[PDB]
């Protein structure tokens, strides 16, 4: 390692090292605008300037710190005058036309901006001599201000200091080039001709402007930084499952942002995790109903306990189902297993539970994907496991885990260039449609539903495929360590992940499965799968039951007794249950959760309104009382302790799990359900029209069955009737139509009919 | 960085905003250190024991209270004395229980 | 008998009790030296008929809480209230006693509501001695029923009186 | 000098004819900002006539196709400037007594700024 | 550290609090009646955590006029704490948000912080 | 910057037809518990626009906790008197003297209406 | 004159001697050496013991020796019989697990009530003390309260319909090992002083 010297102190750091995380390396500060982390450094606030002797022989100007490498026995000086004097000057530079809006600022104590000043500021100049604070007494620059750029985030051209950070994001993590600047000079100003911000991670530029200039909409004007509590969870909306921080005060959700964990998401977060919470805070049921006279009445937990009793008193244990939501906990994964070890049923099973398990494959971590050679993926990244294209956009540049510095996650990483290209070789992609990655995975072909399990007996080499799937093909046999990767439609289709199996267990290679539930992972290492009877998630088979999610309404009808465990009150509730729950979400829960990667991950409950709402934990508990059998679970502590003993490691640790268990089922083709980032209940407020439904077919087909360009279709799936808008795309083949799974019932393909 | 702005250049300076901002939610942070200085008050020797870890708010106070210790006293003044003058003995020994408690 | 049951009676007892207010001092913290200021000769708390001052709580009826409640003096104080003949009443001075004031803490009882049932409350820091007089005349008009809250209810003439002792 | 009084005063006539232009057009005029000098005053003493300072019209989308702004109460070099954004399009007008408002010595009549307008309408709107 | 009774059931509570008790002498012990929102006492809900010094007993948010029969449970409780020779009475006032968590964290830390918070009550607040 | 943390203000966007402040930001809800607060004027030295301004009303003395937090349209400089002298008014039907006087009041309370030394 | 010879004597023996540019002296005296050489102290004529000031360092951003620290105040008054004005402290460090000190009781009773305060406020029990008795918390207070790890014990506060505050996430004020609402503070938030 190379030897660094700051100021008093010397620090053993790796060669490829940016002199701006040397210094903090040794304990020094120096102020950082133009540079951030996980973005290609240029010089352009020039505050991170530093001195430099390279032997005594101090270099000349000022180095810029942010992209300057570090060399062997060299002395950093950042306390001189000089240093100081040129920060403040810097600083008045930065400051000379802002628009005075700091305490009007959404922005408020978090930024960045004011605590630079007040850290590195107004040097002492030499008294009790009345100093004067600007010099600048002109005409400030005056633009356009709180210019709603899309429904979820808001643009002050004001309040922009001319760093790059927007522009520099948009090229280089999601590859969606939907903002610049337009004009030069002084009058240069952020915008675009690309309004709708069609990136689906517009919304991490909100964290990242140092300024007040990109905000959140739907948390405009709730409370100030420092008011809002902040909670530190984890998002369990897919299988990612990134690291989030709730802001919440008074009762309600006012704010979700990005928190950094890098063994998963660097400091990422999607729209649909950050912009997707106005249904949780604005209408959900705090008061347990029962049905009296065929209608739903608020009732008391006893009374509501009393008629559980009664309901279930004349049950035979293998009649009881157990069916829960994709984020239940391992804490409720593992009360529900063993009481259904108790309790004699065939069928329990979850929301998101695939014909194949996502268990079957072995998990790998985002970081070895990052050292990994090839990826042959299967399915939409960007949608059915969002923030995996991200990773996938360090990737195929080259990207790799840097060097940890004592600080964290270094400041400024060296190995990411400006511009960086794209390759076209390191990934393979074969999906339905053309998804937003087909620009960069050179092999690529767009198939119909179906159609993977022939491109994956193609790749094991028992037929001849297209040029696409031999390109492939051959790009899988020569890869020294490829990933496999498969989606939700592989996940639903017994033979495709069946020979996904067998060409990653052949070749030595992991998988990244894009489950429809988040916690499916968790689920089945506790062994919520049904039985030899089965009836599933989607069967009509148990005779009393209860739910934790909304069944298709066919799984509804015919059973004896239904008990739902909800948030929200459906409609589809009220006309085929009993006893209505009210459940907490998981912004206000406290458990584990098993990532895409095997990995444990902590929620913390949030102090959100959640009325007299209980876990399904303690419902289960009580539920079971009814019918004799005694649950070992009611708090976190003991499920804790029953982890422990079924040998799951603590937090950020990799559950070790396999499983060799396919229950196959045929699946009837004449709609698709489009794996979609956008979640169903998200649809509240400003997401109403971000997260709507789309029915996608070929101006062909739609020409043959009338569907317009524009036009609101009501569509009936056996998950429900909704209405959909139909869009006209030439990728979806002719004779499908693509209707958007705004659920965890992706990758399903499905009987339906177009309703008038 | 000790004093907010004046009052009336805070609709003039940018710096102005941001010193009373900062100076009104945040504070300001003194360097890491130990201090203690003491002051005459009506009741003796006060002083105020100040460990600060550089951040916005201090890390111990601690405060030699005179009525405290001047208390000791009282077993010892008031030995021998009347029973009616252990209460003139008290008022001349000028406690202040805000002082004392604390 | 509680100064109840005669049309004139009622109102000749309430009369009395409220302008024959005999404070009970209780002096804790720099609340109480207002509550001693309400008495010097510029402006005395000593006309309405509070010239007598029973330090024996078997003699007063007027107990203000005046200073922050430490929670060791909890009980004592109690005990104080206990030890006053029933026709009792009791005023919360102060931000302190009142709610948990500034000092929110292990060390002080957030509001003194808990340790006795209040009659008025008076905030200031400390309540101006002249605040002091407008509650005493506030508890004055309450114990002849004459007083009314912001939602509107008359409010009943002896708070303490609607407690199960225990 | 005094001149100074009818330039502020000069303003709001200026912002009625932009008002007037959206009234005549159908097209979304905004207020987007006021004074600073103004807001944070507490005590002290305000005789200008108006508080804004910054004004623009926006098309259905959003986007603002013209920008005029005045030089703060305070602040030196007074004037009042105006801008096209995306042409790279700047005025810096001042007013001559008497003869009336001028950009430079050629006066700015409401007809010119109408026209101006009307020319940025056609050409930056989007929709 | 044990948890009897539950959420929202009044009586429930009160009965399985009854079996619990059994004969054990209250002379030394504290009874902290946690709650939120300190004035309001008519529609106020409240959780109990017992400290007798040699092992301690939790009863979750199910007494109070909030829920039907809670005042008349929560009489009935005070009226068995103070028969059993109870003398040393308090509350504890949380956040509504905590009430939930302070029964999930450990033993050592939500007592800890209940006795630190705590406020000398009189009992005929509840009676 | 309130020792006692006793001010509460959720904010909200002004109305550009009929504005309630002067720039983009108002205060929907502004309470101030009495009971908490100290009298410090660390609010009034952080106020930047000048509008939250201690005045003189000390005969503030209410029965209720739950009363005595004053909000909004308890304070502005148009109300004359406090809670419970406005409710005595209202329920006696006649208007409020304030039992105070002072000999001006300050230009940082420009429109507080007082009686002022008897110069009335 | 008399602390210059105090300093000769602790150098001489090797104990660090720590001093501020403002003009206080610290004198760091081991455990063993401490109750001897204070009482060397007292006989050097130090009349006064002003402090007994207890100190844990728990969440202190530096590391330093010791959890818990005790300082003792010696001074001689000046208008005495023979007074320099001498006056200095005595830190003594005490080990998280063992709270343990001799009183100086015996020397100064002043340290009846200081030690019994920091045997109340802090887990450090004085040996030798005539009585260790709770002096200002309450008797049935369990624990002690100035040590970080012990809560400072908070309640919210109310508003009208719902509207609370938690004041612990409501401070924008940093301690010492809070990182900050930015990335971090450098800079004048991380230490400034002025040179005069
Ligand atoms: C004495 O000083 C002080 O007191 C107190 C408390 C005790 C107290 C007593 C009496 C007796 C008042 C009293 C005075 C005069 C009359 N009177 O009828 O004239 C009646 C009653 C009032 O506050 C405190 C707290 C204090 O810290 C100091 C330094
Ligand atoms: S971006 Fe920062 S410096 Fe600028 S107005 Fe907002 S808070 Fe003030
Ligand atoms: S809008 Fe924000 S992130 Fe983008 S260039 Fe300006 S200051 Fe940087
Ligand atoms: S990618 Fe998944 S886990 Fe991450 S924020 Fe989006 S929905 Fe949540
Ligand atoms: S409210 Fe103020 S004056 Fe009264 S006891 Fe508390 S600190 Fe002292
Ligand atoms: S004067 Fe203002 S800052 Fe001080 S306690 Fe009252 S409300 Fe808080
Ligand atoms: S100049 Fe912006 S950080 Fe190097």
């Given at each position: 390692?190379?030897?660094?010297?700051?100021?008093?102190?010397?620090?053993?750091?790796?060669?490829?090292?940016?002199?701006?995380?040397?210094?903090?390396?040794?304990?020094?500060?120096?102020?950082?605008?133009?540079?951030?982390?996980?973005?290609?450094?240029?010089?352009?606030?020039?505050?991170?300037?530093?001195?430099?002797?390279?032997?005594?022989?101090?270099?000349?100007?000022?180095?810029?710190?942010?992209?300057?490498?570090?060399?062997?026995?060299?002395?950093?000086?950042?306390?001189?005058?000089?240093?100081?004097?040129?920060?403040?000057?810097?600083?008045?530079?930065?400051?000379?036309?802002?628009?005075?809006?700091?305490?009007?600022?959404?922005?408020?104590?978090?930024?960045?901006?004011?605590?630079?000043?007040?850290?590195?500021?107004?040097?002492?100049?030499?008294?009790?001599?009345?100093?004067?604070?600007?010099?600048?007494?002109?005409?400030?620059?005056?633009?356009?201000?709180?210019?709603?750029?899309?429904?979820?985030?808001?643009?002050?051209?004001?309040?922009?200091?001319?760093?790059?950070?927007?522009?520099?994001?948009?090229?280089?993590?999601?590859?969606?080039?939907?903002?610049?600047?337009?004009?030069?000079?002084?009058?240069?100003?952020?915008?675009?001709?690309?309004?709708?911000?069609?990136?689906?991670?517009?919304?991490?530029?909100?964290?990242?402007?140092?300024?007040?200039?990109?905000?959140?909409?739907?948390?405009?004007?709730?409370?100030?930084?420092?008011?809002?509590?902040?909670?530190?969870?984890?998002?369990?909306?897919?299988?990612?499952?990134?690291?989030?921080?709730?802001?919440?005060?008074?009762?309600?959700?006012?704010?979700?942002?990005?928190?950094?964990?890098?063994?998963?998401?660097?400091?990422?977060?999607?729209?649909?995790?950050?912009?997707?919470?106005?249904?949780?805070?604005?209408?959900?049921?705090?008061?347990?109903?029962?049905?009296?006279?065929?209608?739903?009445?608020?009732?008391?937990?006893?009374?509501?306990?009393?008629?559980?009793?009664?309901?279930?008193?004349?049950?035979?244990?293998?009649?009881?189902?157990?069916?829960?939501?994709?984020?239940?906990?391992?804490?409720?994964?593992?009360?529900?297993?063993?009481?259904?070890?108790?309790?004699?049923?065939?069928?329990?099973?979850?929301?998101?539970?695939?014909?194949?398990?996502?268990?079957?494959?072995?998990?790998?971590?985002?970081?070895?994907?990052?050292?990994?050679?090839?990826?042959?993926?299967?399915?939409?990244?960007?949608?059915?496991?969002?923030?995996?294209?991200?990773?996938?956009?360090?990737?195929?540049?080259?990207?790799?885990?840097?060097?940890?510095?004592?600080?964290?996650?270094?400041?400024?990483?060296?190995?990411?260039?400006?511009?960086?290209?794209?390759?076209?070789?390191?990934?393979?992609?074969?999906?339905?449609?053309?998804?937003?990655?087909?620009?960069?995975?050179?092999?690529?072909?767009?198939?119909?539903?179906?159609?993977?399990?022939?491109?994956?007996?193609?790749?094991?080499?028992?037929?001849?495929?297209?040029?696409?799937?031999?390109?492939?093909?051959?790009?899988?046999?020569?890869?020294?360590?490829?990933?496999?990767?498969?989606?939700?439609?592989?996940?639903?289709?017994?033979?495709?992940?069946?020979?996904?199996?067998?060409?990653?267990?052949?070749?030595?290679?992991?998988?990244?499965?894009?489950?429809?539930?988040?916690?499916?992972?968790?689920?089945?290492?506790?062994?919520?799968?049904?039985?030899?009877?089965?009836?599933?998630?989607?069967?009509?088979?148990?005779?009393?039951?209860?739910?934790?999610?909304?069944?298709?309404?066919?799984?509804?009808?015919?059973?004896?007794?239904?008990?739902?465990?909800?948030?929200?009150?459906?409609?589809?509730?009220?006309?085929?249950?009993?006893?209505?729950?009210?459940?907490?979400?998981?912004?206000?829960?406290?458990?584990?959760?098993?990532?895409?990667?095997?990995?444990?991950?902590?929620?913390?409950?949030?102090?959100?309104?959640?009325?007299?709402?209980?876990?399904?934990?303690?419902?289960?508990?009580?539920?079971?009382?009814?019918?004799?059998?005694?649950?070992?679970?009611?708090?976190?502590?003991?499920?804790?302790?029953?982890?422990?003993?079924?040998?799951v490691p603590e937090a950020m640790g990799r559950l070790s799990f396999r499983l060799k268990e396919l229950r196959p089922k045929e699946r009837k083709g004449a709609f698709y359900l489009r794996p979609t980032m956008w979640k169903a209940h998200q649809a509240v407020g400003k997401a109403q029209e971000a997260a709507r439904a789309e029915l996608w077919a070929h101006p062909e087909t739609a020409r043959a069955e009338a569907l317009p360009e524009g036009a609101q279709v009501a569509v009936e799936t056996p998950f429900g009737r909704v209405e959909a808008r139909v869009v006209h795309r030439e990728d979806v083949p002719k004779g499908h139509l693509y209707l958007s799974a705004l659920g965890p019932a992706a990758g399903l393909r499905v009987e339906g009919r177009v309703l008038v | 960085q000790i004093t907010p702005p004046p009052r009336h250049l805070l609709e003039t300076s940018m710096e102005a905003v941001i010193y009373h901002f900062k100076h009104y939610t945040e504070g300001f942070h003194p360097p890491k250190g130990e201090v203690y200085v003491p002051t005459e008050s009506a009741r003796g020797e006060l002083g105020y024991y100040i460990v600060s870890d550089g951040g916005s708010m201090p890390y111990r106070v601690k405060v030699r209270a005179p009525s405290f210790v001047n208390l000791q006293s009282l077993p010892y003044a008031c030995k021998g004395e009347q029973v009616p003058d252990m209460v003139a003995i008290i008022a001349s020994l000028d406690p202040v229980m805000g002082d004392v408690d604390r | 008998r509680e100064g109840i049951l005669f049309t004139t009676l009622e109102k000749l007892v309430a009369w009395g009790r409220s302008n024959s207010l005999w404070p009970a001092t209780f002096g804790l913290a720099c609340c109480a030296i207002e509550?001693?200021?309400?008495?010097?000769?510029?402006?005395?708390?000593?006309?309405?008929?509070?010239?007598?001052?029973?330090?024996?709580?078997?003699?007063?009826?007027?107990?203000?809480?005046?200073?922050?409640?430490?929670?060791?003096?909890?009980?004592?104080?109690?005990?104080?209230?206990?030890?006053?003949?029933?026709?009792?009443?009791?005023?919360?001075?102060?931000?302190?006693?009142?709610?948990?004031?500034?000092?929110?803490?292990?060390?002080?009882?957030?509001?003194?509501?808990?340790?006795?049932?209040?009659?008025?409350?008076?905030?200031?820091?400390?309540?101006?001695?002249?605040?002091?007089?407008?509650?005493?005349?506030?508890?004055?008009?309450?114990?002849?029923?004459?007083?009314?809250?912001?939602?509107?209810?008359?409010?009943?003439?002896?708070?303490?009186?609607?407690?199960?002792?225990? | 000098?005094?001149?100074?009084?009818?330039?502020?005063?000069?303003?709001?006539?200026?912002?009625?004819?932009?008002?007037?232009?959206?009234?005549?057009?159908?097209?979304?005029?905004?207020?987007?900002?006021?004074?600073?000098?103004?807001?944070?005053?507490?005590?002290?003493?305000?005789?200008?006539?108006?508080?804004?300072?910054?004004?623009?019209?926006?098309?259905?989308?959003?986007?603002?196709?013209?920008?005029?702004?005045?030089?703060?109460?305070?602040?030196?070099?007074?004037?009042?400037?105006?801008?096209?954004?995306?042409?790279?399009?700047?005025?810096?007008?001042?007013?001559?007594?008497?003869?009336?408002?001028?950009?430079?010595?050629?006066?700015?009549?409401?007809?010119?700024?109408?026209?101006?307008?009307?020319?940025?309408?056609?050409?930056?709107?989007?929709? | 550290?044990?948890?009897?009774?539950?959420?929202?059931?009044?009586?429930?509570?009160?009965?399985?609090?009854?079996?619990?008790?059994?004969?054990?002498?209250?002379?030394?012990?504290?009874?902290?009646?946690?709650?939120?929102?300190?004035?309001?006492?008519?529609?106020?809900?409240?959780?109990?955590?017992?400290?007798?010094?040699?092992?301690?007993?939790?009863?979750?948010?199910?007494?109070?006029?909030?829920?039907?029969?809670?005042?008349?449970?929560?009489?009935?409780?005070?009226?068995?704490?103070?028969?059993?020779?109870?003398?040393?009475?308090?509350?504890?006032?949380?956040?509504?948000?905590?009430?939930?968590?302070?029964?999930?964290?450990?033993?050592?830390?939500?007592?800890?912080?209940?006795?630190?918070?705590?406020?000398?009550?009189?009992?005929?607040?509840?009676? | 910057?309130?020792?006692?943390?006793?001010?509460?203000?959720?904010?909200?966007?002004?109305?550009?037809?009929?504005?309630?402040?002067?720039?983009?930001?108002?205060?929907?809800?502004?309470?101030?518990?009495?009971?908490?607060?100290?009298?410090?004027?660390?609010?009034?030295?952080?106020?930047?626009?000048?509008?939250?301004?201690?005045?003189?009303?000390?005969?503030?003395?209410?029965?209720?906790?739950?009363?005595?937090?004053?909000?909004?349209?308890?304070?502005?400089?148009?109300?004359?008197?406090?809670?419970?002298?406005?409710?005595?008014?209202?329920?006696?039907?006649?208007?409020?003297?304030?039992?105070?006087?002072?000999?001006?009041?300050?230009?940082?309370?420009?429109?507080?209406?007082?009686?002022?030394?008897?110069?009335? | 004159?008399?602390?210059?010879?105090?300093?000769?004597?602790?150098?001489?023996?090797?104990?660090?001697?720590?001093?501020?540019?403002?003009?206080?002296?610290?004198?760091?005296?081991?455990?063993?050496?401490?109750?001897?050489?204070?009482?060397?102290?007292?006989?050097?004529?130090?009349?006064?013991?002003?402090?007994?000031?207890?100190?844990?360092?728990?969440?202190?951003?530096?590391?330093?020796?010791?959890?818990?620290?005790?300082?003792?105040?010696?001074?001689?008054?000046?208008?005495?019989?023979?007074?320099?004005?001498?006056?200095?402290?005595?830190?003594?460090?005490?080990?998280?697990?063992?709270?343990?000190?001799?009183?100086?009781?015996?020397?100064?009773?002043?340290?009846?009530?200081?030690?019994?305060?920091?045997?109340?406020?802090?887990?450090?029990?004085?040996?030798?003390?005539?009585?260790?008795?709770?002096?200002?918390?309450?008797?049935?207070?369990?624990?002690?309260?100035?040590?970080?790890?012990?809560?400072?014990?908070?309640?919210?506060?109310?508003?009208?319909?719902?509207?609370?505050?938690?004041?612990?996430?409501?401070?924008?004020?940093?301690?010492?090992?809070?990182?900050?609402?930015?990335?971090?503070?450098?800079?004048?938030?991380?230490?400034?002083?002025?040179?005069?």
């Amino acid at each position: 390692m190379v030897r660094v010297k700051v100021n008093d102190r010397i620090v053993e750091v790796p060669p490829g090292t940016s002199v701006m995380d040397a210094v903090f390396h040794a304990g020094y500060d120096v102020p950082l605008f133009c540079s951030e982390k996980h973005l290609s450094p240029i010089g352009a606030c020039r505050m991170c300037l530093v001195r430099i002797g390279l032997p005594i022989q101090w270099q000349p100007k000022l180095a810029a710190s942010c992209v300057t490498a570090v060399a062997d026995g060299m002395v950093v000086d950042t306390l001189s005058d000089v240093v100081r004097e040129a920060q403040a000057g810097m600083v008045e530079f930065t400051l000379l036309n802002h628009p005075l809006d700091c305490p009007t600022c959404d922005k408020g104590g978090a930024c960045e901006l004011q605590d630079r000043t007040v850290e590195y500021g107004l040097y002492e100049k030499y008294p009790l001599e009345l100093p004067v604070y600007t010099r600048f007494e002109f005409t400030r620059r005056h633009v356009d201000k709180h210019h709603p750029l899309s429904p979820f985030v808001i643009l002050d051209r004001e309040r922009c200091i001319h760093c790059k950070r927007c522009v520099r994001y948009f090229e280089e993590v999601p590859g969606d080039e939907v903002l610049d600047f337009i004009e030069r000079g002084v009058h240069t100003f952020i915008g675009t001709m690309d309004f709708g911000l069609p990136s689906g991670f517009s919304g991490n530029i909100t964290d990242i402007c140092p300024v007040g200039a990109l905000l959140d909409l739907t948390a405009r004007f709730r409370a100030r930084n420092w008011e809002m509590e902040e909670t530190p969870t984890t998002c369990a909306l897919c299988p990612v499952g990134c690291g989030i921080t709730a802001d919440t005060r008074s009762g309600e959700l006012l704010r979700i942002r990005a928190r950094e964990v890098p063994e998963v998401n660097e400091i990422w977060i999607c729209d649909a995790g950050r912009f997707g919470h106005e249904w949780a805070d604005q209408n959900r049921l705090k008061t347990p109903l029962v049905r009296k006279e065929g209608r739903l009445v608020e009732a008391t937990w006893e009374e509501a306990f009393l008629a559980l009793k009664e309901g279930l008193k004349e049950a035979r244990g293998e009649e009881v189902g157990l069916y829960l939501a994709h984020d239940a906990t391992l804490e409720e994964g593992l009360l529900a297993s063993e009481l259904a070890k108790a309790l004699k049923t065939p069928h329990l099973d979850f929301q998101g539970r695939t014909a194949a398990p996502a268990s079957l494959f072995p998990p790998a971590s985002l970081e070895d994907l990052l050292q990994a050679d090839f990826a042959l993926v299967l399915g939409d990244p960007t949608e059915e496991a969002p923030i995996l294209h991200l990773r996938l956009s360090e990737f195929v540049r080259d990207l790799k885990p840097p060097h940890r510095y004592n600080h964290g996650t270094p400041f400024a990483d060296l190995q990411i260039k400006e511009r960086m290209p794209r390759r076209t070789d390191k990934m393979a992609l074969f999906a339905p449609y053309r998804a937003p990655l087909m620009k960069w995975a050179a092999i690529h072909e767009v198939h119909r539903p179906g159609e993977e399990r022939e491109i994956l007996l193609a790749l094991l080499g028992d037929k001849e495929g297209s040029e696409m799937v031999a390109k492939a093909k051959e790009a899988w046999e020569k890869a020294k360590n490829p990933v496999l990767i498969l989606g939700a439609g592989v996940l639903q289709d017994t033979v495709a992940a069946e020979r996904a199996r067998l060409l990653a267990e052949r070749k030595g290679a992991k998988v990244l499965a894009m489950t429809p539930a988040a916690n499916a992972r968790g689920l089945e290492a506790m062994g919520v799968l049904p039985g030899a009877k089965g009836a599933s998630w989607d069967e009509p088979g148990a005779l009393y039951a209860y739910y934790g999610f909304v069944p298709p309404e066919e799984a509804l009808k015919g059973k004896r007794f239904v008990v739902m465990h909800l948030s929200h009150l459906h409609p589809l509730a009220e006309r085929y249950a009993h006893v209505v729950l009210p459940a907490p979400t998981f912004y206000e829960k406290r458990g584990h959760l098993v990532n895409l990667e095997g990995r444990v991950l902590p929620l913390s409950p949030a102090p959100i309104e959640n009325g007299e709402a209980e876990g399904a934990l303690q419902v289960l508990a009580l539920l079971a009382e009814a019918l004799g059998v005694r649950p070992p679970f009611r708090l976190h502590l003991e499920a804790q302790k029953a982890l422990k003993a079924r040998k799951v490691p603590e937090a950020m640790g990799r559950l070790s799990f396999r499983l060799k268990e396919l229950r196959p089922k045929e699946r009837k083709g004449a709609f698709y359900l489009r794996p979609t980032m956008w979640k169903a209940h998200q649809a509240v407020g400003k997401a109403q029209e971000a997260a709507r439904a789309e029915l996608w077919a070929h101006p062909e087909t739609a020409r043959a069955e009338a569907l317009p360009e524009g036009a609101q279709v009501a569509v009936e799936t056996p998950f429900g009737r909704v209405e959909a808008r139909v869009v006209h795309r030439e990728d979806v083949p002719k004779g499908h139509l693509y209707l958007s799974a705004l659920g965890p019932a992706a990758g399903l393909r499905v009987e339906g009919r177009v309703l008038v | 960085q000790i004093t907010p702005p004046p009052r009336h250049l805070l609709e003039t300076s940018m710096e102005a905003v941001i010193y009373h901002f900062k100076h009104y939610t945040e504070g300001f942070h003194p360097p890491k250190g130990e201090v203690y200085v003491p002051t005459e008050s009506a009741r003796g020797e006060l002083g105020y024991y100040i460990v600060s870890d550089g951040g916005s708010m201090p890390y111990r106070v601690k405060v030699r209270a005179p009525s405290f210790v001047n208390l000791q006293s009282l077993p010892y003044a008031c030995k021998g004395e009347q029973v009616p003058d252990m209460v003139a003995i008290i008022a001349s020994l000028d406690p202040v229980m805000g002082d004392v408690d604390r | 008998r509680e100064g109840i049951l005669f049309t004139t009676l009622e109102k000749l007892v309430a009369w009395g009790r409220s302008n024959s207010l005999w404070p009970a001092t209780f002096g804790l913290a720099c609340c109480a030296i207002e509550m001693m200021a309400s008495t010097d000769a510029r402006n005395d708390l000593a006309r309405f008929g509070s010239e007598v001052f029973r330090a024996s709580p078997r003699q007063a009826d007027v107990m203000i809480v005046a200073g922050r409640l430490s929670k060791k003096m909890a009980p004592v104080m109690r005990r104080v209230w206990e030890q006053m003949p029933d026709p009792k009443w009791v005023i919360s001075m102060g931000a302190c006693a009142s709610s948990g004031g500034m000092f929110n803490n292990y060390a002080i009882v957030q509001n003194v509501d808990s340790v006795v049932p209040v009659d008025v409350y008076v905030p200031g820091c400390p309540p101006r001695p002249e605040a002091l007089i407008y509650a005493v005349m506030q508890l004055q008009k309450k114990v002849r029923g004459q007083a009314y809250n912001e939602r509107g209810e008359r409010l009943p003439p002896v708070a303490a009186w609607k407690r199960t002792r225990g | 000098a005094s001149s100074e009084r009818e330039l502020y005063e000069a303003w709001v006539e200026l912002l009625s004819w932009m008002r007037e232009y959206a009234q005549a057009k159908g097209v979304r005029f905004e207020k987007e900002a006021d004074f600073p000098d103004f807001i944070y005053r507490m005590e002290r003493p305000y005789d200008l006539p108006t508080t804004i300072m910054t004004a623009s019209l926006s098309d259905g989308l959003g986007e603002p196709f013209l920008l005029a702004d005045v030089s703060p109460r305070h602040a030196k070099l007074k004037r009042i400037g105006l801008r096209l954004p995306r042409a790279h399009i700047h005025l810096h007008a001042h007013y001559e007594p008497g003869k009336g408002l001028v950009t430079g010595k050629i006066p700015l009549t409401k007809e010119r700024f109408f026209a101006l307008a009307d020319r940025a309408r056609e050409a930056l709107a989007f929709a | 550290m044990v948890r009897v009774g539950m959420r929202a059931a009044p009586r429930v509570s009160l009965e399985a609090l009854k079996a619990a008790l059994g004969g054990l002498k209250l002379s030394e012990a504290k009874v902290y009646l946690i709650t939120d929102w300190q004035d309001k006492r008519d529609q106020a809900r409240y959780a109990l955590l017992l400290h007798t010094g040699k092992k301690d007993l939790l009863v979750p948010d199910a007494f109070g006029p909030a829920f039907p029969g809670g005042e008349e449970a929560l009489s009935e409780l005070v009226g068995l704490l103070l028969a059993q020779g109870a003398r040393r009475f308090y509350e504890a006032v949380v956040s509504p948000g905590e009430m939930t968590a302070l029964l999930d964290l450990p033993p050592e830390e939500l007592l800890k912080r209940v006795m630190a918070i705590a406020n000398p009550t009189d009992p005929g607040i509840y009676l | 910057a309130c020792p006692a943390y006793a001010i509460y203000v959720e904010p909200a966007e002004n109305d550009p037809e009929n504005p309630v402040s002067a720039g983009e930001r108002y205060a929907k809800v502004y309470e101030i518990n009495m009971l908490r607060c100290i009298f410090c004027g660390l609010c009034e030295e952080a106020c930047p626009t000048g509008a939250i301004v201690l005045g003189y009303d000390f005969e503030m003395a209410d029965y209720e906790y739950s009363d005595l937090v004053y909000g909004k349209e308890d304070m502005l400089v148009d109300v004359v008197g406090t809670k419970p002298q406005r409710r005595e008014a209202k329920r006696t039907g006649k208007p409020v003297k304030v039992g105070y006087v002072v000999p001006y009041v300050r230009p940082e309370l420009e429109g507080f209406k007082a009686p002022t030394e008897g110069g009335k | 004159m008399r602390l210059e010879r105090v300093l000769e004597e602790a150098r001489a023996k090797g104990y660090p001697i720590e001093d501020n540019g403002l003009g206080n002296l610290w004198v760091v005296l081991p455990r063993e050496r401490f109750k001897e050489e204070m009482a060397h102290y007292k006989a050097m004529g130090f009349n006064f013991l002003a402090d007994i000031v207890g100190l844990d360092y728990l969440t202190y951003p530096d590391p330093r020796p010791e959890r818990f620290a005790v300082v003792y105040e010696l001074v001689s008054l000046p208008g005495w019989k023979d007074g320099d004005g001498s006056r200095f402290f005595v830190r003594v460090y005490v080990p998280e697990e063992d709270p343990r000190l001799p009183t100086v009781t015996d020397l100064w009773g002043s340290a009846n009530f200081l030690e019994r305060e920091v045997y109340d406020l802090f887990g450090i029990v004085f040996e030798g003390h005539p009585d260790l008795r709770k002096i200002l918390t309450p008797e049935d207070l369990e624990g002690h309260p100035l040590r970080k790890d012990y809560p400072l014990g908070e309640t919210p506060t109310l508003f009208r319909e719902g509207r609370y505050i938690i004041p612990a996430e409501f401070r924008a004020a940093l301690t010492g090992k809070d990182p900050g609402l930015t990335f971090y503070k450098g800079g004048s938030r991380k230490g400034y002083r002025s040179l005069w």
